[PDB]
Structure 1
Amino acid sequence: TLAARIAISNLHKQTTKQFSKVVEDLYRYVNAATGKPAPMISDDVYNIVMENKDKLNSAIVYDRDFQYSYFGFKTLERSYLLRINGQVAERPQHLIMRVALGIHGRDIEAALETYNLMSLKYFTHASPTLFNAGTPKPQMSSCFLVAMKEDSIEGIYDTLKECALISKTAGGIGLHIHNIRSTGSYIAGTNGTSNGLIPMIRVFNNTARYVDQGGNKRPGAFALYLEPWHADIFDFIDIRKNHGKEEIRARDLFPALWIPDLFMKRVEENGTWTLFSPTSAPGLSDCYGDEFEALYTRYEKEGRGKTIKAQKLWYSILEAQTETGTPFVVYKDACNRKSNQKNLGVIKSSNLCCEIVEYSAPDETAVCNLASVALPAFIETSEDGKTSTYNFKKLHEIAKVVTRNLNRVIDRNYYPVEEARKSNMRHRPIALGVQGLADTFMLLRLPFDSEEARLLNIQIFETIYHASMEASCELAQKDGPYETFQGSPASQGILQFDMWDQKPYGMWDWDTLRKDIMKHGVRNSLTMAPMPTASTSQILGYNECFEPVTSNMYSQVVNPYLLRDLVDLGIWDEGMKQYLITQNGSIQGLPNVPQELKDLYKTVWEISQKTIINMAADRSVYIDQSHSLNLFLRAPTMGKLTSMHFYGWKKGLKTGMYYLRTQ
């Protein structure tokens, strides 16, 4: 559409063009209503801009502002570009140059390299980085994984405090609560008993809502992590349920299951399952695999809990998931067996979006900062004819840059709580991701479920994982390995695919890298955790992350690629707009569309979730952490769902399921 250039040109007409001067204004800004001087730029970045303004102003190519779509730019304007008394002060390029400086500080070279690549749409950083980079309290991290400090009012309320402090800034929360005693449990020095997790959850629900103040963008939702042996498990998983008593729900928090392998076996073999209070059965969350199964079975023997039929729980879980899309599913044993952080202790949760897998304890709140590579941007014409090449060398090198960025962020970040700073300065985890897999397959003319798409997926993630580990090893040569590197799998030369007992695909030289790593270490304990990318991909104009498209339409967002093809066949007309709306966005079962187009523009409800699960399994061997595997069910059935779960579970997935999106 042409409405983009209209809006963009009109932003230009309402904004100063000299970057140094917009920085000046932003930095000099004063709250007229209050007389308070209210700077939107840090001292150190303001200075840097001033000490370099010529060099900075002239690197900006303001043309690049047009490389956004209408929906894209409006996303930028509505939430991203810094505002002055109600209206937009920053141009897109300003936002970008500002983010670039906030990341690189005095390294003007890097800053310019980041500006360039970002402005050309090669990658982007997560929302909190776009919001806060270069601003006075630069809270750039997206993820915090919080341990419930202790089963006491002090611990509970200390945790709640911490979560409010985190939520207030950017940053979602994954909070694990396995150590909280269940309903009916004994409390010393009183004859009343505990009312369990649900009342305590309602406290967190309430604080989640409170921390959301005005001009909306101080969000940071909560996901809560519970192992399914917890005695309060049946109420826990119903949190988002649409009905029942409004004093037992909690509609702003998300349930996530931290599932041991044992649970799944019990279900499969149609056996028993036992609920415990953490009090009556301590340590369950502080071991995994064999250790846990021994420990668990003993508590079972000792009569410490209440036994039910495993498939009772299972059935309930499926019903919650069907009706609400939750609880999420993440496999505790896959996460622990296959984590480079296993020298730290047992990992007890993932994050808000089920992609982060990092160690947390009461004094250590795991943090991650995220960025995503724009996959379609590495598509190239050959010595033409083809236009059917992916440039894996360019992708390798951008990943290298993004890795160096995410490292800078660790150091230039303002941490909302001391636990987060202690954690991140110690292990320095990082999280690279992607958007536009769907676009990329399409541009290369690959059906999502083809053997070419399957191969390209593998190669892509091999080069990102390789690139990041390489960039990271380089940093460890410059600055030393991260503090806890000694004793990790990676110190032993065990990398992620090794942990899946797989040879890597071999498009890159892993032995040399592995040699270098054992020699020099890595700067980062973890590097890859493909994430939802909701609004960042929207700004870039690409499909969410690594999923197929959900539609070829939307409101009247018509697939650029579909559309191109329809036209190249003339068959696209006016009674053509008519079909893709009347059917929710599918092209299958249309009378006059070439089979090849049908196969290429399969909608995610038309793709086999088995296919989906295989591809996630394929890429997972190169994924350090995990990834946000949404699952989509056509006409959901309890059996379809059970099969889908055990399939990913048996595939060794860490995150078996994020949202269940349905019908």
Structure 2
Amino acid sequence: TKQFSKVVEDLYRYVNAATGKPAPMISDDVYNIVMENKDKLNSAIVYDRDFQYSYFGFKTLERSYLLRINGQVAERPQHLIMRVALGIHGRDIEAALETYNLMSLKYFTHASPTLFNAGTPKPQMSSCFLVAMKEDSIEGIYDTLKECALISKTAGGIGLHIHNIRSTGSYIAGTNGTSNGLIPMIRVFNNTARYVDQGGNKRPGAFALYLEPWHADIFDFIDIRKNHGKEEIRARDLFPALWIPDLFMKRVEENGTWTLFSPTSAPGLSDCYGDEFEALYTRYEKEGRGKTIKAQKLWYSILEAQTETGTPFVVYKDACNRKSNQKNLGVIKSSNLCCEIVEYSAPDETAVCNLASVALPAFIETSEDGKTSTYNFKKLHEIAKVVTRNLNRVIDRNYYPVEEARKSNMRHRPIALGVQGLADTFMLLRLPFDSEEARLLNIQIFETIYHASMEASCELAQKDGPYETFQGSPASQGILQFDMWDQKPYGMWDWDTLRKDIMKHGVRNSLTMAPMPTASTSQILGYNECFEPVTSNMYSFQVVNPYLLRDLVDLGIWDEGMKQYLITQNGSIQGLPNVPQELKDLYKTVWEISQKTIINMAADRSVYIDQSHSLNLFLRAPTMGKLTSMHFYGWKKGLKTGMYYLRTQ
């Protein structure tokens, strides 16, 4: 079917034939809206815009995104986009059309759960949940398990922190028995992640687990992904993530000692950070409450697990807490599944985020005369304020799987904007990733996205009031993200006036920035993942980097001896017979870029990031000394997410 209202009509009237059950795929209010504005909405749609998707991006859309009736596809990409626009915007037709246009022209896109569920009856548009283990008891464990199950019924990944659970051998009152510890309890959770598929479909598993490196069960925990296992000791479908206090990095650097506690013989450690933590830790240590070991014995094991599995993830507890606008809430005990979100959670508050990404290439414009291109920072600023408003709408229109998630979200209203196609943007603008021009561009991009999102949230706070927990926040006092890094902003945008308005009117959102992986939403738009360099100049069907391809032909030098060398060399063009140094410098693979520049750039953009970002590390010829220096480099650079995956060859 062409006509959109006709498509909506089918979707809405759909009935499951195998069961005789009316199975509507559109909500009542979004049906009524479409029908009450059929002519406007149908004639707004430009189907020519369906041809903006590459063969692969469209096949990503077809396989898992466009709504289906009886297994056959029912939605054209333009129909999905308008459905999302209405689901987000409802009655505000003006904004719906604005978002339809911006999205269909590929200026930005919303995270997968949004694309799946916006305008449908069960509108669960959130990607992230961070859950607190409720209590160190069988009941608390099982209330928490139930909660993960209920959340796993819907789209979205889970970060779960377990710092409060009794380690192996700890005592259980009213029985000569002792605790089994973390591993056997992790196994239960792993099994629940395997069971709750949403049925029998394909994105299954995936809980990230958060632990501080002092927990006595740590050596087994970091190893939960080891493939050569002792079998029952592992958790195949779960991800270990380390919640590292500075003290640990210090002890490792000093080649000193590290002490392992059960939370029960050393209470309160995860409910403080910084100097208060170091004082409590050091006191417990001297009081003989734990099992002292050599710091570097744990370190060696961490690196060994990382080298082999790519995990555990590394997120610095102290950086996260010290530099968070949610610090008036209490101590943040975890990140999330992909290490971008940094939000407070408690037994009654399960932190949620809704994400979107701005497509960075869309703002490159030659508009001057011929050839020479610039970057439209003004349009970016403009779009980022649109994306900001959309994500607030989503907050209010979202259906929450559990009450801890609704209570959390309505209270603090956190939002997460990110990017895709940074590599595309550098490549188009003739900038090497490690160039000074790339370094500058990365700072200014993140500056304007942050400023925009903050300005738009301040405007929303004027219309609607600040978020419930604004007062007492570092924003209420004028302390914006970069301030908490003790830096002046780059200064492309007027921060004094914005800060002046925040202090006066509030912001609508406790948080706004968390550049995410964009793993599937980068494929729809056809750009490179988030903020990371190209991994290979040969996609695989087998595709060669389009900006590379173009360049080779313009030089004549593209034959077959060129096509074969690329498949040989893993899409690297370094040390290749007849290629200019300019291309070599431009089309470096991530394996060919100084992991130090990656971390520098990460640290530069990080002053404009409210939350954190999913920072993969790529080591070509990996060693323990090499990896050690990347961890400590990022740690001293003040990073929140020292490391997402360790990807290796």
Smaller-chain TM-score bracket: over 0.9
CA distance in 2, matches of 1:280, 1:512: 50
* 3-state secondary structure, aligned to 2:259: strand
Check conservation: 2:240, 2:312, Cα contact below 8 A.
yes
Shift of residue 362, structure 1, vs aligned partner: 0.1
Shift of residue 383, structure 1, vs aligned partner: 1.4
Q: Name the residue aligned to 1:544.
A: 529
Question: Which of 350, 369, 380 pairs up with 1:384?
Answer: 369
Shift of residue 244, structure 1, vs aligned partner: 2.2
Q: Deviations over 1:160-206 (max 9, x none)?
A: 00001111100100000000000000001111100100000000000
* 3-state secondary structure, aligned to 1:256: strand
Check conservation: 2:152, 2:198, Cα contact below 8 A.
no
* 3-state secondary structure, aligned to 1:199: helix
CA distance in 2, matches of 1:454, 1:313: 35
Q: Deviations over 1:561-615 (max 9, x none)?
A: 0000000011101222111001111000001000000000000000000000000
CA distance in 1, matches of 2:34, 2:198: 32
2:579 is equivalent to residue 596 of structure 1: no
Name the Cα RMSD after superposition: 0.7
* 3-state secondary structure, aligned to 1:492: coil
* 3-state secondary structure, aligned to 1:414: coil
Check conservation: 1:172, 1:220, Cα contact below 8 A.
no
Alignment map for 1:378-457 (pairs within 5 Å): 378-385=363-370, 387-457=372-442
Shift of residue 312, structure 1, vs aligned partner: 0.2
CA distance in 2, matches of 1:86, 1:506: 52
CA distance in 2, matches of 1:244, 1:391: 52
Check conservation: 2:603, 2:638, Cα contact below 8 A.
yes
Give the 3 Å change call, closer, same or farther, for CA 115–220 of structure 1 in structure 2: farther
Could you tell which deviates more after superposition, 238-247 or 348-357? 238-247
Check conservation: 1:170, 1:220, Cα contact below 8 A.
no
Check conservation: 2:222, 2:305, Cα contact below 8 A.
yes
Q: Deviations over 1:276-330 (max 9, x none)?
A: 0000000000000000000000000100000000000000000000000000000
2:174 is equivalent to residue 161 of structure 1: no
CA distance in 2, matches of 1:550, 1:215: 32
Q: Deviations over 1:9-59 (max 9, x none)?
A: xxxxxxx00000100000000000100000000011001101111100000
User: Normalising by structure 2, what TM-score?
Assistant: 0.99
Shift of residue 387, structure 1, vs aligned partner: 3.0
CA distance in 1, matches of 2:67, 2:496: 46
2:121 is equivalent to residue 136 of structure 1: yes
Q: Name the residue aligned to 1:620.
A: 606
Check conservation: 1:240, 1:324, Cα contact below 8 A.
yes
Q: Deviations over 1:545-575 (max 9, x none)?
A: 0000000003222100000000001110122
CA distance in 2, matches of 1:512, 1:496: 16
Could you tell which deviates more after superposition, 217-226 or 152-161? 217-226
Check conservation: 1:167, 1:219, Cα contact below 8 A.
no
Check conservation: 1:481, 1:520, Cα contact below 8 A.
yes
Check conservation: 1:330, 1:656, Cα contact below 8 A.
yes
Shift of residue 388, structure 1, vs aligned partner: 2.3
CA distance in 2, matches of 1:599, 1:223: 37
* 3-state secondary structure, aligned to 1:273: strand
User: Normalising by structure 1, what TM-score?
Assistant: 0.97
Length, aligned pairs only: 648
Shift of residue 136, structure 1, vs aligned partner: 0.1
CA distance in 2, matches of 1:217, 1:319: 30
Check conservation: 2:470, 2:506, Cα contact below 8 A.
yes
Check conservation: 1:170, 1:219, Cα contact below 8 A.
no
Give the 3 Å change call, closer, same or farther, for CA 213–482 of structure 1 in structure 2: closer
Check conservation: 1:173, 1:220, Cα contact below 8 A.
no
Unpaired runs of at least 5, structure 2: none
Shift of residue 97, structure 1, vs aligned partner: 0.3
* 3-state secondary structure, aligned to 2:561: coil
Check conservation: 2:416, 2:512, Cα contact below 8 A.
yes
Check conservation: 1:170, 1:218, Cα contact below 8 A.
no
CA distance in 2, matches of 1:297, 1:386: 62
Shift of residue 245, structure 1, vs aligned partner: 1.1
Check conservation: 1:168, 1:218, Cα contact below 8 A.
no
Could you tell which deviates more after superposition, 542-551 or 239-248? 239-248
Shift of residue 213, structure 1, vs aligned partner: 4.4
Give the 3 Å change call, closer, same or farther, for CA 256–323 of structure 1 in structure 2: same
Q: Deviations over 1:229-268 (max 9, x none)?
A: 0000000000000112110010100000000000000000
Question: Which of 632, 644, 647 pairs up with 1:646?
Answer: 632
Give the 3 Å change call, closer, same or farther, for CA 247–260 of structure 1 in structure 2: same
Q: Deviations over 1:454-504 (max 9, x none)?
A: 000000000000000000000000000000000000000110000000000
Shift of residue 217, structure 1, vs aligned partner: 4.6
CA distance in 1, matches of 2:487, 2:294: 36
Check conservation: 2:89, 2:390, Cα contact below 8 A.
yes
Check conservation: 2:194, 2:205, Cα contact below 8 A.
no
Unpaired runs of at least 5, structure 1: 1-15
Shift of residue 212, structure 1, vs aligned partner: 1.1
CA distance in 2, matches of 1:237, 1:388: 48
Moved over 6 A (4+): none
Q: Deviations over 1:368-402 (max 9, x none)?
A: 00000000000001413453200000000000000
Identity of aligned residues (%): 100
CA distance in 1, matches of 2:85, 2:253: 51
* 3-state secondary structure, aligned to 1:223: strand
Q: Deviations over 1:124-183 (max 9, x none)?
A: 000000000000010000000000000001000000000011111001000000000000
Q: Deviations over 1:73-95 (max 9, x none)?
A: 00000000000001100000000
Alignment map for 1:93-108 (pairs within 5 Å): 93-108=78-93
Shift of residue 221, structure 1, vs aligned partner: 1.8
CA distance in 2, matches of 1:362, 1:34: 39
Shift of residue 214, structure 1, vs aligned partner: 3.6
Check conservation: 2:205, 2:237, Cα contact below 8 A.
no
Check conservation: 1:340, 1:490, Cα contact below 8 A.
yes
CA distance in 2, matches of 1:372, 1:213: 25
CA distance in 1, matches of 2:545, 2:570: 13
Alignment map for 1:261-300 (pairs within 5 Å): 261-300=246-285
Could you tell which deviates more after superposition, 266-275 or 377-386? 377-386
Q: Name the residue aligned to 1:483.
A: 468
CA distance in 1, matches of 2:54, 2:88: 26
CA distance in 1, matches of 2:86, 2:145: 34
* 3-state secondary structure, aligned to 2:177: coil
Q: Deviations over 1:629-658 (max 9, x none)?
A: 000001000000000000000000000000
CA distance in 2, matches of 1:386, 1:265: 52
